[PDB]
């Protein structure tokens, strides 16, 4: 069946199929006592949009201006953002539009299909793969749980910094042991952080001889979301590399941060020039770790399954195996191929190239640039097929991302 995106208006009635009131996945944490439930919309099978601010972790629980020293000088705060029905509908439409954009190229469509289908490896109960809260969200009505519906990804609005974007895996052992975990994403389609890149096709003073200089650009929020979707994919496969750092001075992996280092999960997820000279030692170790984790799960869990149900079908589609019920083995060659796709081929920089989107050269930015607001729902500014770089308007070849474009609106900070 061809992937379609379900459209919604925020005021669409609850149906228990695609429109629910969702209990927070992190409801058991003390900081989330009494929160929700929140209206949620199933945009793609197992992918839900919740038009609420993300405030469900320690670092996102307070939406006010931080009481500590600020981590990012390009952050912008507004505790009231996304508290009205009209802002919630705008957000919902924006996320849907960005997803339609992503689906409009085969690489983006395949990414969405992968997230939809790649359920975490369930626990086994009475010989059957059986769902947990690591693979579902609860539809809560009047302090009763009506149903538990499958979910691999829940997309929310931003946390405290309304121009920040992030991914959170639900359970921290499954995120890295090969099982996989439901992910939450905090996403901001309308508030964007600019970046610098060298460029030559812009209005320039006649007295400047050499026109190719660093210029300011806005990112395409589809690229921003795809970046998070790559983290989500790692999280669903249980292959997150959050607890390793790559040291650019030595070219080695380290367990703790160093002066000129980057978290390895971000190095891979962003891609680009910085991932082109990773050592064979590093790549071999990463592959071996994942292979070992999967071999262990196939032995200790998958081979305890005695009941063939739909969850087993979905898991066999996710995890390349050979053999029969009770005696599966990892399909080494197919697993390696799939792993190397998800780790080394799937990344923001490669995806952006396929979408004709400009991204920055390095994951880490050299300087903060004040965030902007842009109404991406206006097709004159941002289209599903071309983003900001609209050919019929003369904005192809990255020109539509130039920050001087009128649709990138200054924020009073
Ligand atoms: Zn990232």
Token duo for residue 113: 């299909």
Domain ranges of the chain: 1-413
Give me ligand 1 centre to Cα 270, in Å.
7
Alpha carbons 380 and 400: distance in angstroms, whole number: 11
Cα of 231 vs centre of ligand 1, distance in Å, is: 7
Residue positions counted in the chain: 413
Cα–Cα distance for residue pair 19/39, rounded to 1 Å: 7
Question: Coil, strand or helix: which one is 334?
Answer: helix
| CA 51 to ligand 1 centroid distance, Å | 21
Q: If you measure from the C-alpha of residue 84 to the centroid of ligand 1, how many angstroms do you get, rounded to a whole number? A: 29
Q: What technique solved it?
A: X-ray
Are 168 and 154 a contacting pair, CB within 8 Å?
A: no
Q: What is the DSSP string of 46-79?
A: TEEEE-S----SGGGS--SSPSS--S-TT--B-T
Q: How many CB atoms lie within 10 A of CB 364?
A: 13
Are the C-beta atoms of residues 46 and 119 closer than 8 Å to each other?
A: yes
Q: Quick one: how far is CA 3 from the chain centroid?
A: 19
Reading phi first (left if > 0) and then psi (alpha if -120 to 50, else beta), residue 123 is in beta
| Dist. CA 159 → ligand 1 center (Å) | 15
User: How far away, in angstroms, is 224 Cα from ligand 1 center?
Assistant: 9
Distance 363 CA to ligand 1 centre (A): 8
Contact residues for 211 (Cβ-Cβ < 8 A; gap 6+): 200, 202, 204
Report which secondary-structure segment, H or E, holds 316. Answer: helix 310-318
Cα distances (Å, whole numbers) of residue 257 to 117, 244, 254, 263? 34, 8, 7, 8
- Euclidean distance between CA atoms 217 and 214, whole angstroms: 10
The tokens for 384 are 């599903």
Query: Resolution, in Å, please?
Result: 1.4
Count H helices and E strands in the chain, helices first.
8, 20
Kindly state the tokens that stand for 227: 């970046």
CA distance to 49, 140, 384, per residue, from 6 (Å): 11, 22, 15
Q: What is the DSSP letter of 111?
A: H
Record the tokens describing residue 378, joined without a space.
Answer: 């206006």
**183-186/153-156 β-pairing:** parallel
Q: Is 265 a catalytic residue?
A: no
C-alpha to C-alpha distance for 267 and 342, rounded to whole angstroms: 13
Contact 89, 10 (CB under 8 A): yes
Residue 322 Cα to ligand 1 middle (Å):
34
322 strand-pairing partners: 329
Q: Which token pair is 289?
A: 């770790």
Q: What is the DSSP string of 266-300?
A: HHHHH-GGGGTT--HHHHHHHHHHHHHHHHHHHHH
194 phi-psi bin (left φ>0, alpha ψ -120 to 50, beta other)? beta
Task: Determine contact, residues 149/136, Cβ cutoff 8 Å.
Answer: yes
CB 48 within 8 A of CB 150: no
In 142-220, which ranges are continuous DSSP H helix? none
CA distance 222 to 98: 5
CA distances to 48, 133, 134, 344 from 140, in Å: 15, 14, 17, 39
Instruction: Determine the Cα–Cα distance for residues 248 and 36; give it in Å rounded to an integer.
Output: 43
Closest to 97 (Cα-Cα) out of 1, 7, 26: 7
72 CA → ligand 1 middle, Å: 15
- Tokens representing 236 are 């669903």
Dihedral, CA atoms, 64, 269, 99, 411, nearest 10 degrees?
40
- Paired with 42 in beta bridges are 48
Nearest to 43 by CA among 88, 99, 87, 107: 99
CA of 354 to the centre of ligand 1 (A): 19
Q: In angstroms, what is the span from residue 182 Cα to ligand 1's centroid?
A: 17
CA distances from 350 to 127, 358, 360, 389 (A): 42, 11, 12, 17
Supply the Cα-derived Rg of the chain in whole angstroms: 22
Tokens in use for 256?
A: 């703790």
Question: Residue holding tokens 């599903």?
Answer: 384
d(CA 48, CA 40): 6
DSSP 320-331: -EES-TT--EE-
Q: Which among 173, 167, 192, 370 has a CA at the least distance from the CA of 270? A: 167
Which of 177, 192, 107, 188 has its CA nearest to residue 155? Answer: 188
Which residue among the candidates 90, 100, 179, 228 is catalytic per the annotation?
Answer: 228
Q: Pairing mode, if any, of strands 213-217 and 252-254? A: unpaired
With beta carbons less than 8 A apart as the criterion, state whether 152 and 47 touch.
yes
């Amino acid at each position: 069946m061809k992937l379609e995106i379900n459209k919604f208006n925020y005021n669409d009635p609850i149906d228990g199929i695609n429109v629910i009131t969702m209990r927070p996945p992190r409801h058991s944490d003390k900081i989330n006592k009494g929160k929700g439930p929140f209206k949620a919309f199933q945009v793609i099978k197992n992918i839900w949009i919740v038009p609420e601010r993300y405030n469900f972790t320690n670092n996102t629980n307070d939406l006010n201006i931080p009481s500590e020293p600020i981590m990012e000088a390009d952050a912008i705060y507004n505790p009231n953002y996304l508290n009205t029905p009209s802002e919630k509908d705008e957000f919902l439409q924006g996320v849907i539009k960005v997803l339609e954009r992503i689906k409009s190229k085969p690489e983006g469509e395949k990414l969405l299909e992968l997230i939809s289908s790649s359920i975490p490896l369930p626990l086994v109960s009475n010989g059957a793969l059986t769902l947990s809260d690591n693979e579902t969200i609860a539809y809560q009505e009047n302090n009763n749980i009506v149903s538990n519906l499958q979910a691999n990804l829940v997309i929310y609005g931003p946390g405290p910094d309304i121009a920040n974007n992030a991914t959170y895996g639900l359970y921290s052992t499954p995120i890295s042991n090969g099982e996989g975990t439901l992910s939450e994403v905090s996403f901001s389609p309308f508030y964007l952080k600019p970046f610098d890149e060298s460029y030559g096709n812009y209005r320039s003073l006649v007295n400047i001889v050499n026109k190719f200089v660093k210029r300011e650009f806005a990112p395409d929020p589809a690229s921003t979301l795809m970046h998070e979707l790559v983290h989500v994919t790692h999280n669903l496969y249980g292959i997150s590399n959050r607890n390793f750092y790559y040291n650019f001075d030595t070219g080695k992996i380290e367990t703790s941060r160093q002066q000129n280092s980057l978290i390895f999960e971000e190095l891979l997820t962003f891609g680009g020039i910085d991932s082109k000279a990773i050592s064979s030692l590093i790549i071999k170790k990463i592959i071996e770790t994942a292979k070992n984790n999967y071999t262990t799960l196939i032995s200790e869990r998958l081979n305890t399954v005695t009941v063939e149900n739909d969850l087993l079908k979905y898991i066999k589609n996710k995890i390349p195996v050979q053999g029969r019920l009770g005696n599966f083995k990892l399909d080494t060659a197919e697993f390696e191929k799939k792993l190397n796709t998800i780790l080394f081929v799937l990344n923001e920089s490669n995806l952006a190239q396929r979408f004709s989107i400009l991204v920055r050269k390095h994951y880490l930015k050299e300087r903060p640039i004040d965030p902007i607001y842009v109404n991406i729902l206006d097709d004159n500014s941002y289209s599903t097929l071309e983003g900001f770089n609209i050919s019929s308007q003369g904005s192809n070849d990255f020109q539509g991302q130039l920050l001087e474009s009128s649709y990138f609106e200054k924020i009073e900070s």
